[PDB]
C-alpha atoms as one frame of an Amber mdcrd trajectory, in Angstrom:
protein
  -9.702  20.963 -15.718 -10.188  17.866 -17.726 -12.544  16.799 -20.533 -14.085
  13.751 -19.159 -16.194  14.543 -16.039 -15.451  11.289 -14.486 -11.805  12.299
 -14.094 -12.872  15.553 -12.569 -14.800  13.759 -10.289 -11.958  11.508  -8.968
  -9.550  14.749  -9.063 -11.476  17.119  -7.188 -11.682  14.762  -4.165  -7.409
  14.811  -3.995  -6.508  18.740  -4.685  -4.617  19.865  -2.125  -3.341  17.769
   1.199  -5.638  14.653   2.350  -5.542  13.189   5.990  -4.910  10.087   6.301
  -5.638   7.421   9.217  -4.404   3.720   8.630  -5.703   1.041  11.496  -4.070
  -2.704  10.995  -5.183  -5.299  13.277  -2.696  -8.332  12.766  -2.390 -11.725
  13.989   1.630 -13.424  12.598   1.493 -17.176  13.961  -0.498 -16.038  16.845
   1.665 -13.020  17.421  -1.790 -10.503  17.756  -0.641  -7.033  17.425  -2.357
  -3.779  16.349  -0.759  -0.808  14.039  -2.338   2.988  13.942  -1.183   5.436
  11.712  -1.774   9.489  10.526  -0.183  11.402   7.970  -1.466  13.257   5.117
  -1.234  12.339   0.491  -0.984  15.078  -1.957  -1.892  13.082  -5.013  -0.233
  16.257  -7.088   3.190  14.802  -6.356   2.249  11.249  -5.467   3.633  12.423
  -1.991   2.093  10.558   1.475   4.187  11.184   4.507   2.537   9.025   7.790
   3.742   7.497  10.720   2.775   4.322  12.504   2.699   3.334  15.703   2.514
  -0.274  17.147  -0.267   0.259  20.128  -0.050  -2.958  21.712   3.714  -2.625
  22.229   6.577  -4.259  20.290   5.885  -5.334  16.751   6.255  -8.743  15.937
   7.313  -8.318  12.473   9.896  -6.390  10.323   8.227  -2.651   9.735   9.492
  -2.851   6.137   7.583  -6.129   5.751   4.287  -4.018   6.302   5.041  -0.912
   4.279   3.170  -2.449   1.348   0.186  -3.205   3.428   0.200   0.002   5.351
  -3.475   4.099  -0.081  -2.667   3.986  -4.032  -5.151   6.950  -4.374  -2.470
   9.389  -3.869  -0.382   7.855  -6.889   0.460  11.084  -8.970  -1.628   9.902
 -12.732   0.193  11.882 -15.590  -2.604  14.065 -16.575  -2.432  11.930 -20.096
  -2.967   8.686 -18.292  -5.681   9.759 -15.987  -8.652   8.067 -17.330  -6.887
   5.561 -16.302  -7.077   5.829 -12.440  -9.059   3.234 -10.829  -8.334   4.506
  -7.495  -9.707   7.897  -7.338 -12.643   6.854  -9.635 -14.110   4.920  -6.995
 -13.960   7.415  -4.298 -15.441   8.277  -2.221 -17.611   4.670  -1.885 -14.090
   3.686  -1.722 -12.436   0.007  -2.522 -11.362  -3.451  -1.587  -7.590  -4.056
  -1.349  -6.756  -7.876  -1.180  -3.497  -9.275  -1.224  -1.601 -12.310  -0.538
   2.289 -11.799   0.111   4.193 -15.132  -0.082   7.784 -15.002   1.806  10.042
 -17.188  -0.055  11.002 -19.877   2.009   8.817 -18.897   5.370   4.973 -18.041
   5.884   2.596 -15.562   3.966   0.291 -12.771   4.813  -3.358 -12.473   3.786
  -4.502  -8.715   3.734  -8.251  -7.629   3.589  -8.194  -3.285   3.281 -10.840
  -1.044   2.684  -9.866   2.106   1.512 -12.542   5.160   1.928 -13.636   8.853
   2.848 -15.306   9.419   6.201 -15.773  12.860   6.215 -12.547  14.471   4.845
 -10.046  11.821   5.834  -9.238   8.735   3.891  -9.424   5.695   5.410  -7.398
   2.409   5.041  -8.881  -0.103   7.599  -7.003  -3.643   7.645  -7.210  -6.727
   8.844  -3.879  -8.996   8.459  -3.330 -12.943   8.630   0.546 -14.438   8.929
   0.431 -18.101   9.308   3.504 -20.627   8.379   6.410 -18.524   8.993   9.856
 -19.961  10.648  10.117 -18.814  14.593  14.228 -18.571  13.222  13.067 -17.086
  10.301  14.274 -13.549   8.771  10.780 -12.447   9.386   9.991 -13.489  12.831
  13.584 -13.427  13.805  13.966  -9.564  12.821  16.399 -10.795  10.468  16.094
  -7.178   7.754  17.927  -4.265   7.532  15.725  -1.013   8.224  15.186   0.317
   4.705  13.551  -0.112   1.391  14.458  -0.023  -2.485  12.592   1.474  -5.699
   9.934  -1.191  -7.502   7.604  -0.741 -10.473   4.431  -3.046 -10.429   2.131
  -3.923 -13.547  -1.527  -2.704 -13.312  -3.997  -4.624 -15.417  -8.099  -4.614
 -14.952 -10.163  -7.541 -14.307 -13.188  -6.614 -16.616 -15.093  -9.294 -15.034
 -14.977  -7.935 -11.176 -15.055  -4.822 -12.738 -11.373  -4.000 -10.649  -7.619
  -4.479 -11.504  -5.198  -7.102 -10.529  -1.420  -6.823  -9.864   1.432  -9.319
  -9.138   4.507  -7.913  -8.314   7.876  -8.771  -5.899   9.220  -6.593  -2.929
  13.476  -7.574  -2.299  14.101  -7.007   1.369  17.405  -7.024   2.210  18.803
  -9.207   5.066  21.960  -7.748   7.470  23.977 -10.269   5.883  23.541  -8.542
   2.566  20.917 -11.504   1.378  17.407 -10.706  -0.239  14.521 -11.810   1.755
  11.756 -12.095  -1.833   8.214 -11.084  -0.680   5.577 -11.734  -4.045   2.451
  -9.923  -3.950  -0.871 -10.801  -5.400  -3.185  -8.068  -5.241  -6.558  -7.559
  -6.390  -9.088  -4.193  -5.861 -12.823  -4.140  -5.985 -15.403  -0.887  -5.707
 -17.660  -1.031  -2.819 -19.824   1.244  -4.334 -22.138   0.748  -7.473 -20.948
   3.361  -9.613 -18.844   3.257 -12.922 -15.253   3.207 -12.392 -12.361   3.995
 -14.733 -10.907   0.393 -15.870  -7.522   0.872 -17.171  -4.975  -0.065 -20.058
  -1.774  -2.206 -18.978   0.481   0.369 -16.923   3.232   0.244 -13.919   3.481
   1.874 -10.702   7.045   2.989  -9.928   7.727   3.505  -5.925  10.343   5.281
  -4.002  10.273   4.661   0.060  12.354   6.061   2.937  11.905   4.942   6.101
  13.055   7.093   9.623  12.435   6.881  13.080  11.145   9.915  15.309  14.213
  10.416  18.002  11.603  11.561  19.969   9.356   9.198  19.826   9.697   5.866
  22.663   6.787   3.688  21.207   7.988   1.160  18.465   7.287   3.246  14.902
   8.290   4.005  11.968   7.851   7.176   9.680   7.575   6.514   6.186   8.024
   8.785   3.049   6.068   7.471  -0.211   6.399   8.999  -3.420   4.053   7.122
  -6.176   3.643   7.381 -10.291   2.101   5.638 -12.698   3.979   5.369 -15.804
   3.941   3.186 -19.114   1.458   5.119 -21.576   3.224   7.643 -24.236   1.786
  10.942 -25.424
């Protein structure tokens, strides 16, 4: 229950628990690889629990290098902030997620996502380009630990595309006990036509734990996401 029928909309679509299926074809300095993923987001709690699989065998790449890449619909929006969710208002059209991730002192990735309902499961469909990175590298050299750490990232709209922008950096921490910086520039469009809810500066704050399945023989990871926006006072 809300008073502005756009954020009823955008809320409506996220009660309850959402299925989620994540496909990532990838191509790291000719390395081609492809990533499929299922879980399920309960936008109440900011909560997504999924795990990936690599389905063309052994991933070329650090998992926690792709955890960024791998649905910021099921951020949990304060309910005094939530005219100010772009990510549900443009649902179920869906969006654009682009991002370029620059790996201080090695190569970068260029993402291309979109993000969308077909049928009742959300959709995050990616295509990924690594180019310039180090064959000794910490990247291509599976140089980082297996873990992640807590990060906040500024939100601000881009009136002009009618979308936000964010630039924010991920630490990853080398088994040396060195800091591999990854900086991300992102920007999101709509796909659809439709209004969407263009919002006042706020942050994103991030907790991820990453596990492995002992079950499980195929190269993976399970990830646990909790996501909420923050920044705006009552």
């Amino acid at each position: 229950h809300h008073t502005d029928p756009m954020v009823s909309k955008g809320e409506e679509l996220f009660t309850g628990v959402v299925p989620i299926l994540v496909e990532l074809d990838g191509d790291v300095n000719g390395h081609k690889f492809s990533v499929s993923g299922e879980g399920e987001g309960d936008a109440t709690y900011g909560k997504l629990t999924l795990k990936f699989i690599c389905t063309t065998g052994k991933l070329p790449v650090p998992w926690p290098t792709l955890v960024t890449t791998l649905v910021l619909c099921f951020s949990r929006y304060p309910d005094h902030m939530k005219q100010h969710d772009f990510f549900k208002s443009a649902m179920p059209e869906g969006y654009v997620q682009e991002r370029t991730i620059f790996f201080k002192d090695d190569g970068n990735y260029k993402t291309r996502a979109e993000v969308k309902f077909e049928g009742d499961t959300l959709v995050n469909r990616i295509e990924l380009k690594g180019i310039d990175f180090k064959e000794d590298g910490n990247i291509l050299g599976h140089k980082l630990e297996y873990n992640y750490n807590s990060h906040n990232a500024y939100i601000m709209a881009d009136k002009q595309k009618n979308g936000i922008k964010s630039n924010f950096k991920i630490r990853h921490n080398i088994e040396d006990g060195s800091v591999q910086l990854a900086d991300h520039y992102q920007q999101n469009t709509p796909i659809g036509d439709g209004p969407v809810l263009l919002p006042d500066n706020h942050y994103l704050s991030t907790q991820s734990k990453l596990s492995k399945d002992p079950n499980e023989k195929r190269d993976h990871m399970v990830l646990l996401e909790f996501v909420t926006a923050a920044g705006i006072t009552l």
